[PDB]
């Protein structure tokens, strides 16, 4: 946020991506920074045999495509909802870093917060089994944007095949963790919407 | 400069998770290990930092220390106050620190995918194949020889010394390894 956006996105190159649309492909070598005005994206990487895997989500006020500003695209960035995003060239960012140093702290603050979540992501895969990881992943998507409050808990918009690429198992084997958790009295599975108690 | 200079011996902890001392560190010479604990006190190694690397910098933009930092060898490290670094911001030093942070996501995010979809047996499977990177690996006529303990492997794969020990039992009769005392030979 802050007042750095007015100086940064002064030369708007606003783009609108529909849901499911890919914005960044891994391996590309184009020097472009993105800022999310409204919407949410999905960050995807590959495992060891070339399957895609969800790492996290970025929301409004988030930058992405910024790891090349310092000395190839490291991940896929896909729009999960309708995203309003603006481009800034790496060249424009380099000049405005000299007109103000708070844009590198704004960018560094998001880079540091992504390290924390991703480092927590490494440990949650080592010290948790699949049942516990679908339990945490549900627990993490509440303290995450786009969940309204429910009388008995929270509502989240996620499919089981999305959870399988977050926790590292198949959607069918995840069918239980949602099934077994639903009959214990923690969760609701319905179409595109889950209720966590 | 000066002042800053402190020397940590091998195995010595430099940063504890949960601490709030708002201080930046720079490695003059040596290398550290970044470790996290599970919620009942089991270790896992996240990575290593070497000469020219900063650490203790994630609060520099805001909090609780995010990981344990342990000295792998005798390390010489320098303080930087968050104020001194912020005052010295004035200007290429913010690009230098961000370049180290950008490489830390890539390596750590790449580590997530290699750890996901793997069970404890599978992490010991490559970690033994990964054990070529350790500076204590000898050549074997039929493969590689390394001197490593179960509690050292337990901090790489994130599981107990007993579970790493049985998994190696199953692997020795399957055909990767032969265990002799404190040294195992991995075939192929
Ligand atoms: N672990 C992660 N957490 C959050 N965002 C990421 C992560 N890894 C990559 N990204 C984003 O995905 C982008 C892909 O291209 P870049 O490397 O240019 O910049 C990257 C970041 O914006
Ligand atoms: N995944 C990681 N990779 C590399 N370094 C890390 C990682 N997680 C934490 N650190 C470093 O360890 C430090 C511990 O304290 P801070 O959170 O202040 O800043 C942290 C980073 O400098
Ligand atoms: Au704009
Ligand atoms: Au599985
Ligand atoms: Au001092
Ligand atoms: Au300190
Ligand atoms: Au374990
Ligand atoms: Cl809540
Ligand atoms: Cl599995």
Curated annotation (Swiss-Prot), chain A:
Name assigned to this protein: cAMP-activated global transcriptional regulator Vfr
Residues binding 3',5'-cyclic AMP: 51-52, 65-67, 73-74, 118-119, 165, 171
Keywords of the record: cAMP, cAMP-binding, DNA-binding, Nucleotide-binding, Transcription, Transcription regulation, Virulence
GO molecular function, one term: DNA-binding transcription factor activity
Subunit organization: Homodimer.
Organism of this sequence: Pseudomonas aeruginosa (strain ATCC 15692 / DSM 22644 / CIP 104116 / JCM 14847 / LMG 12228 / 1C / PRS 101 / PAO1)
Gene of this entry: vfr
Domain HTH crp-type, residue spans: 128-197
Description of the deletion phenotype: Mutants show loss of twitching motility and are defective in type IV pilus assembly. Expression of ExsA is also strongly affected in the mutant.
Gene Ontology cellular-component terms listed: cytosol; protein-DNA complex
Entry's induction text: Regulated by both cAMP and cGMP to allow differential regulation of different regulons. Cyclic AMP is required for Vfr binding to vfr, regA, ptxR, and cpdA promoter DNA. Cyclic GMP instead inhibits the formation of Vfr-DNA complexes.
Annotated region of DNA binding: 160-179
NCBIfam families: PRK11753.1
The UniProt record lists the keyword Chaperone: no
InterPro entries per UniProt: cNMP-bd_CS (IPR018488), cNMP-bd_dom (IPR000595), cNMP-bd_dom_sf (IPR018490), Env_Response_Regulators (IPR050397), HTH_CRP (IPR012318), RmlC-like_jellyroll (IPR014710), Tscrpt_reg_HTH_Crp-type_CS (IPR018335), WH-like_DNA-bd_sf (IPR036388)
PROSITE patterns from the UniProt entry: CNMP_BINDING_1, CNMP_BINDING_2, CNMP_BINDING_3, HTH_CRP_1, HTH_CRP_2
Database matches in PANTHER family: CRP FAMILY TRANSCRIPTIONAL REGULATORY PROTEIN, DNA-BINDING TRANSCRIPTIONAL DUAL REGULATOR CRP
Coiled coil: none
Signal peptide start and end residues: none
One GO biological process term: positive regulation of DNA-templated transcription
Function: Global cAMP-dependent transcriptional regulator that controls virulence gene expression by distinct cAMP-dependent and -independent mechanisms, which allow to fine tune its virulence program in response to specific host cues or environments. Controls the expression of many regulatory targets including type II, type III and type IV secretion systems, flagellar-mediated motility, and quorum sensing systems. Transcriptional control is exerted by binding to a well-characterized consensus site (5'-ANWWTGNGAWNYAGWTCACAT) within target promoters.
Presence of keyword Coiled coil: no
């Amino acid at each position: 946020k802050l007042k750095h956006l007015d100086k940064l996105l002064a030369h708007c190159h606003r783009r609108r991506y529909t849901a499911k649309s890919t914005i960044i492909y891994a391996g590309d070598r184009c020097e472009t920074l993105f800022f999310i005005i409204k919407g949410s994206v999905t960050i995807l990487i590959e495992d060891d045999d070339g399957r895609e895997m969800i790492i996290g989500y970025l929301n409004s006020g988030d930058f992405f495509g910024e790891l090349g500003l310092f000395e190839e695209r490291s991940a896929w960035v896909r729009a999960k909802v309708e995203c309003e995003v603006a481009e800034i060239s790496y060249a424009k960012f380099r000049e405005l870093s000299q007109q103000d140093s708070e844009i590198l702290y704004t960018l560094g603050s998001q880079m540091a917060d992504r390290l924390r979540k991703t480092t927590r992501k490494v440990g949650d895969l080592a010290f948790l089994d699949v049942t516990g990881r679908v339990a945490r992943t549900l627990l993490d998507l509440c303290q995450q944007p786009d969940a309204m409050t429910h009388p008995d808990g929270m509502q989240i918009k996620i499919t089981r095949q999305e959870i399988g690429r977050i926790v590292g198992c198949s959607r069918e084997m995840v069918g239980r963790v949602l099934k077994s958790l639903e009959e214990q009295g923690l969760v609701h599975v319905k179409g595109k919407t889950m209720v966590v108690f």
